[PDB]
Write a protein that binds this ligand. Sequence first.
Ligand SMILES: [Ag+]
Ligand SMILES: [Ag+]
Length: 329
Amino acid sequence: IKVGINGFGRIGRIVFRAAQKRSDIEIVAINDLLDADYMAYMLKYDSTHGRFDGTVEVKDGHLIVNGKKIRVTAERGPANLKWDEVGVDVVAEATGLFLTDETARKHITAGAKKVVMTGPSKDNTPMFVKGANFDKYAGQDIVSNASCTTNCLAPLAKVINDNFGIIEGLMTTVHATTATQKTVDGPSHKDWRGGRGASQNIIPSSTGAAKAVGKVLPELNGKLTGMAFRVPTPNVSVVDLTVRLEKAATYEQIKAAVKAAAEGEMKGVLGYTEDDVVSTDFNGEVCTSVFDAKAGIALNDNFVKLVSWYDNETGYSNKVLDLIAHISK
Ligand SMILES: [Ag+]
Ligand SMILES: [Ag+]
């Protein structure tokens, strides 16, 4: 019910905005390498999600949003974050630098009770994706909500595998531009393609989302692998999943299966549309996976190609809040 945010990046700020529209969660503390008046500016104005729908003021180095006061730190050593001072139960860790158990444990060292990582773990801290494996949470004090792309692929793949059985799958995501790319051709020694100008290029990139699903859904372990293309669009991405099915199924049977999940057990997580949509039509979508019925194709009853959209910022942020609420129940 009381959360602290570490890191005010794209993910951190959208997590903050989505928390305002909720009754179960109240953010009380924020940490980043930036001043308070600057954070008030970055929260007030956004090129992708418009102006902030509320009040923001700076009073004595602290933020006041909708009348509630937020404590603003800046220390880069998580041990001295004094989480117990304002007394936070869960910490949403969005630096992208402490995706390890050793580093993340500095937070509950500082007086929090649990830690949720807004990225895929690099050790073997457990991962959880809503609709995929929230059932199997076992009370751990540090968790991960996987990647933007894994939150879109896993719910769809569970529905397809449980109805028809997946023998093998290859996926490709047409991914929107992120903060790790460059405006003009620049240096990037880990990924040479990634340093090229994002505004002018289709940039192939590797991704771990397809094999990451094998851990949140052990049934498809080693049955999927994937690849990405980064394109000059500010937001919203799309997944293209090519799979072989054990049990034969027409395309209408697949539509009906997905449609039933989106209106049934996976309402709010999985979405369904039969309209002539484009990427902008999902700017601000909350579901982490919207099936596009009309864009998929089927060669035969056992070889099919499914496409599904996701807002790589909005839907992911909303689901880490659902993960925070789920681990405090
Ligand atoms: Ag929806
Ligand atoms: Ag929704």
